[PDB]
Amino acid sequence: LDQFGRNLTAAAMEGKLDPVIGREKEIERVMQVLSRRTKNNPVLIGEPGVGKTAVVEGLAQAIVHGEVPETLKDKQLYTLFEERLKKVLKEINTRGDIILFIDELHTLQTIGATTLDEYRKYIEAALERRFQPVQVGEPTVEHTIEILKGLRDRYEAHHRVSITDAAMVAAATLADRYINDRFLPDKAIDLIDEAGARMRIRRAEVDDEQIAEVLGNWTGIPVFKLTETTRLLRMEEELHKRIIGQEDAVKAVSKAIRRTSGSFIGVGKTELSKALANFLFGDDLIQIDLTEKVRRFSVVLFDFKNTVLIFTSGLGFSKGEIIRMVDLMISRVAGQLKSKDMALVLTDAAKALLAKRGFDPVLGARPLRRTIQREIEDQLSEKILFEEVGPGQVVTVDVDNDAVFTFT
Amino acid sequence: SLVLDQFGRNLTAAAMEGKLDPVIGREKEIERVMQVLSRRTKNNPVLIGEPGVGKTAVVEGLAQAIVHGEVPETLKDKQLYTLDLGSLVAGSRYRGDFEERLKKVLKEINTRGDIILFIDELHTLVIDAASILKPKLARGELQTIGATTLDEYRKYIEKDAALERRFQPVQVGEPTVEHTIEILKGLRDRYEAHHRVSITDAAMVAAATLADRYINDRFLPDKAIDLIDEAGARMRIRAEVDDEQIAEVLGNWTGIPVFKLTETTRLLRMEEELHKRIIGQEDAVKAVSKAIRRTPSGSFIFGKTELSKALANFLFGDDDALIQIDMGEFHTASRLFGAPPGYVGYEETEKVRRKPFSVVLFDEIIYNSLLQVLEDGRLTDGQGRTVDFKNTVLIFTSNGLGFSFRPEFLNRIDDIIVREEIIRMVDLMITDAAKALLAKRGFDRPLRRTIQREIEDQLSE
Numbered sequence A: 001l002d003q004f005g006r007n008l009t010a011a012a013m014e015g016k017l018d019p020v021i022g023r024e025k026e027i028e029r030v031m032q033v034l035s036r037r038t039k040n041n042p043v044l045i046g047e048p049g050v051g052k053t054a055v056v057e058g059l060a061q062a063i064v065h066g067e068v069p070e071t072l073k074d075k076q077l078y079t080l081f082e083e084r085l086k087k088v089l090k091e092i093n094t095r096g097d098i099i100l101f102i103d104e105l106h107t108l109q110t111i112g113a114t115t116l117d118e119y120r121k122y123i124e125a126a127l128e129r130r131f132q133p134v135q136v137g138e139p140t141v142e143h144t145i146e147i148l149k150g151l152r153d154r155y156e157a158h159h160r161v162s163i164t165d166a167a168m169v170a171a172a173t174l175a176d177r178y179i180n181d182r183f184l185p186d187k188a189i190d191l192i193d194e195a196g197a198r199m200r201i202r203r204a205e206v207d208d209e210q211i212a213e214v215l216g217n218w219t220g221i222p223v224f225k226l227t228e229t230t231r232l233l234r235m236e237e238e239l240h241k242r243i244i245g246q247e248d249a250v251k252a253v254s255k256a257i258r259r260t261s262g263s264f265i266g267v268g269k270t271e272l273s274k275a276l277a278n279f280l281f282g283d284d285l286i287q288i289d290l291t292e293k294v295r296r297f298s299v300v301l302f303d304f305k306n307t308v309l310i311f312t313s314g315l316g317f318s319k320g321e322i323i324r325m326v327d328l329m330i331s332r333v334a335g336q337l338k339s340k341d342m343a344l345v346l347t348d349a350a351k352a353l354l355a356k357r358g359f360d361p362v363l364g365a366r367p368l369r370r371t372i373q374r375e376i377e378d379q380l381s382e383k384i385l386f387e388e389v390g391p392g393q394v395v396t397v398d399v400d401n402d403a404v405f406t407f408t
Numbered sequence B: 001s002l003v004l005d006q007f008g009r010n011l012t013a014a015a016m017e018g019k020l021d022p023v024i025g026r027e028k029e030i031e032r033v034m035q036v037l038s039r040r041t042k043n044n045p046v047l048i049g050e051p052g053v054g055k056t057a058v059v060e061g062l063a064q065a066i067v068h069g070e071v072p073e074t075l076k077d078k079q080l081y082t083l084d085l086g087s088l089v090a091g092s093r094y095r096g097d098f099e100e101r102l103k104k105v106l107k108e109i110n111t112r113g114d115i116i117l118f119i120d121e122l123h124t125l126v127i128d129a130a131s132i133l134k135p136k137l138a139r140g141e142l143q144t145i146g147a148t149t150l151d152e153y154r155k156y157i158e159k160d161a162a163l164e165r166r167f168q169p170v171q172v173g174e175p176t177v178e179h180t181i182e183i184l185k186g187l188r189d190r191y192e193a194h195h196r197v198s199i200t201d202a203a204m205v206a207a208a209t210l211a212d213r214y215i216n217d218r219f220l221p222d223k224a225i226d227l228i229d230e231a232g233a234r235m236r237i238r239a240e241v242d243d244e245q246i247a248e249v250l251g252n253w254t255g256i257p258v259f260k261l262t263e264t265t266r267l268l269r270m271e272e273e274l275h276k277r278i279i280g281q282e283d284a285v286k287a288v289s290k291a292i293r294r295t296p297s298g299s300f301i302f303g304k305t306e307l308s309k310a311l312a313n314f315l316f317g318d319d320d321a322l323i324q325i326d327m328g329e330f331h332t333a334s335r336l337f338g339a340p341p342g343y344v345g346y347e348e349t350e351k352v353r354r355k356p357f358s359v360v361l362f363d364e365i366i367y368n369s370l371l372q373v374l375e376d377g378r379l380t381d382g383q384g385r386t387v388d389f390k391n392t393v394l395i396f397t398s399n400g401l402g403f404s405f406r407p408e409f410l411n412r413i414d415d416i417i418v419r420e421e422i423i424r425m426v427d428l429m430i431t432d433a434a435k436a437l438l439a440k441r442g443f444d445r446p447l448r449r450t451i452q453r454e455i456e457d458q459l460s461e
C-alpha cells in the first residue's frame, strides 16, 4: 500500500538515497542469504552508526541498477492495529515482488538490522530458525575517507561550502583518535557536517584547522594538541616538570617510547607513570595490584593497540634532590597557610632535618608525608589555635640542637 | 481455527498441501510417538534430542502419516497445530494478559476436539502455563507433543515431579553420516528445483562427511543441509554442484585452505610442509613424519616447542591447536580433575574437552591419570563428564664432577625423539660478519631478544 512504509527502491531510482561505497561484500552476503531455501532472512548485526541501513540502501541501489541476480531484479524493497498489519501483510503476499526491510527488528522474506546486544537480548528461539545474522564490520580510516569523499558533493551542496581532501583525512583521523566513544562512519560525517554548519553560520571553504577547532570545541581539548613526532620531542621537558630526580630513567623511557604499543618493567615509578599518562593522553591511567576499563589510549600500571603497559617490582668471615621533594611536599601546607593569609618559610637546616627524619632509603620518600604532618602540621595547628601566630605574619621554621623545631 | 491460526501453523494442512519436506529414516520415532499418543492418560510425548537433530522433522513426518491415513484409528483426521509460548507471553504486561490468551486457546481446542498441540521448547512451560495445563494433561484431555534437549528436559521438566509424570520421553538420536546422506538424497529434488541447479551424490557425501568432521558445534542433518543450501545460493549469485564447491563453502565458513578440504597424498608432504616452518633437526622431524604417517593418535617424548607448533599447524588446526601445560608448578588436583564436589575449584580436561582435536604439550614433566590417558585414551574430570584423547597428540618435554619414569609409562609412549644452522636461523627470524656476530650473541631463545635489542633498535632510530 506504501501508506504504512516507504519504498526504498523508488527513492533509489529517484536518486534521493545517499550513495554507499566500500560495502560490496556485505551486500553480496545479504543477497546470498536472501537466495537461500532456509534461513532466507538476513539480519544485519553491527554497532550503532556502522552503516547497517547503508548496506540495505546499497542493495536497493544494486537492484534498481540491475546488478542483483535474476530472482531479485524485479523486487521492490519496502521499509516499515492488528487488522491493518494483517491487511498490509496480505497485500505483500499477493503482490510477492517486495522484500520488507524492518529497521531495528528488536521492536517487533525480510531484512532486519539490530545491534549485537539487542540481537542477543531480543532475537537470540522461534525467530532464530528464520533469521541468519550478517556481520557489518566497522569501517577503517581509509574506508571512512572513501565514504567522506563520496558524500562530499552532497554535503557541499547542502551547506554551500567547499571541503578539501586534507579536511576529510583530518576529520577521519581526529574522529577515530579522540571521539572513540562513537563509531567512525557516523562520527566523521558528524564532524564534517558540523564544520559546514559553522562555516554557514559565519557567513566558502573548509580546512583541517576548522575540523580541529570543531573537535576541540566538542571535547574541550585545546586546538593546539589536535592540530599539532611533535608530541614526542617535548616528552623530556614535560616529564621533568613533575618528577624529581631519576632523570636517566626519564630519558631512557622517553627514547624507548619514542621508537615505538610499548611495554616497560619505591621512588618515582608511580609518579613517572602518572606524568607519562598526563603528557601522552591528558589525565593524571589505570592502577592495579580490567577489560571493560581499557576497552572503554591509557597507561596500565601493575605491581589494546594504543594501550601502554607498565610493570614494577654471606654466612661468616667475609671481609678481606631530597630538599626539592621536601619543598614540594610542604608546598601544600604553604598554600593552605597562604589561603589563611600566612607565609611559611623553612630554613635549610630545617629541611635537612625533615629529610633525615622522614626519608627512608629502603622505602624511599614514603614516610615523608607523615613525618611532615607530625613535625609541622600538628605544631603549626596547635600554635594557630593558641593565637600566638596571627594572619599576615610570616611563620619561620628553624631547628635547634635529638634536635627540635621552633616557630617564629 | 482463527484462535489457533494466529499462534501456530496447521502442520496437517501443510502436509495436505504438500508444503512439508519428506522425512527419511524416522519410522521408529514416528511409531513410538504414535504409541505414546494412543494411550488413555498422560499421552503427551516429549521429543528429547540435541538441536537440529530432526525433532520438528519427526513431528512433520507424523503429520504426513496422519494425512496419508496410515495412523491408528485414534489419530485419524487429527490436526497438528504448532504453538510457541513466546507468542502467548509476548505483549503481556498486566495481571491476566497471558492467562486470557492461554484459556482462549484451550477453549478453542476443547470446542474443536481433534487438535494436537506441538509445543517446541517445552522446558519454557514451567499460576502459569504449567499450572493451568496440569489438571488437563493428567486426564489425557489435551494431547501435547513437546520438544526439548536432554539437559533442558532434565533441569526443568524432570525436577517438577507433578509435571514430569505427565510427559513421556521419546529419544531422538542424531542421524549417522550414512543416515545423513540418505536424508540429503531424499531432499535433493526440492533443493535442485529451488536453486535451479544439479547436485551430485559425491557432493552430498562430501558435505555430510566434512560437516561431521569439522563443524563440532552443530549437528549432522542440519549442518549438512546448510552446507548444500549455501553452496546452491553461492552458485545462484553467479550449472552443477560438486565436492569442490562444498569444500570452498566450508573453508569460507571456518578458516581453512580450500585445497586442504578438497589424505595419504596430502599426508605424504609432511616433511616438505614441516621444513617450511621449522629448520634443522632433520632427523627428529623425519621420525615424527614417519610415525604420524604410518598411524590416542600419537605420543612422543622430546625446537621442541617450535616442532610441536609446526606439527599442530600442519595437522588439525593452526598453531592455536597447541595446548601448553606447565608441569613445573604441580610439584595438584587442579590440573588432573580440578577438585571433587564441595571443594574449592569445582566450579572451574578443561581445555581438551572444548578442543577435542589438539596437540597437548607438557613442559618440564598425577602419573596415574597420564597412564590411563595413554592406555585407554579417556579421562574423567571432577564433574563426571568424560574427555576423550582418541584423536589428540601428546608431547612430553624434558631437560664433569671429578678429575679429568615408570617402565609402563615409557612403553606406552609411541616414540621418543631427541654452525650453519644458526646462520639459517638468524636470517629466518629476520652481512656475513653481522650474521656470525648475531649467532654468537644469541646462540651458544635469547637470539630474538638480541636481534630486537641491536638490529631493530638501531634501524628504528
Ligand SMILES: Nc1ncnc2c1ncn2[C@@H]1O[C@H](COP(=O)(O)OP(=O)(O)O)[C@@H](O)[C@H]1O
Pocket: A018, A019, A020, A021, A022, A023, A047, A048, A049, A050, A051, A052, A053, A054, A055, A113, A147, A185, A186, A189
Ligand atoms: N558505507 C557507507 N556509505 C555511505 N554512507 C555511510 C556508509 N556507512 C555509514 N554511512 C553513514 O552512516 C550514517 C548512519 O547510517 P546507519 O549506520 O546505517 O544507521 P544505524 O546503524 O543507526 O541503523 C548515515 O549518516 C550514513 O551516511
Ligand SMILES: Nc1ncnc2c1ncn2[C@@H]1O[C@H](COP(=O)(O)OP(=O)(O)O)[C@@H](O)[C@H]1O
Pocket: A243, A244, A266, A267, A268, A269, A270, A271, A325, A364, A365, A366
Ligand atoms: N616506586 C614508587 N614511586 C613513587 N611513589 C611510590 C612508589 N611506590 C610507592 N609509592 C607510594 O606512593 C607514595 C610515595 O610517593 P612520593 O615519594 O611522594 O613520590 P615522589 O618520590 O616522586 O616525589 C607513598 O605512599 C608510597 O607508598
Ligand SMILES: Nc1ncnc2c1ncn2[C@@H]1O[C@H](COP(=O)(O)OP(=O)(O)O)[C@@H](O)[C@H]1O
Pocket: A038, B021, B022, B023, B024, B025, B026, B050, B051, B052, B053, B054, B055, B056, B057, B058, B120, B147, B183, B186, B221, B222, B225
Ligand atoms: N530425518 C530427516 N529427514 C528429512 N529431513 C530432515 C531430517 N532431519 C532433519 N531434517 C532437516 O534438518 C533440519 C533439522 O532441524 P530440526 O531438528 O527440525 O529443529 P529442532 O532443533 O527443533 O529439532 C531441518 O531443516 C529438517 O528439515
Ligand SMILES: Nc1ncnc2c1ncn2[C@@H]1O[C@H](COP(=O)(O)OP(=O)(O)O)[C@@H](O)[C@H]1O
Pocket: B277, B278, B279, B280, B281, B303, B304, B306, B425, B445, B446, B447, B448, B449
Ligand atoms: N630464540 C627463538 N625464539 C623463538 N623461536 C625460536 C628461537 N630459536 C629457535 N626458535 C625455533 O627453534 C628452531 C631451532 O631449534 P631449537 O630452538 O634450537 O631447539 P633445541 O635448542 O632444543 O635444539 C628453529 O627452527 C626456530 O624456528
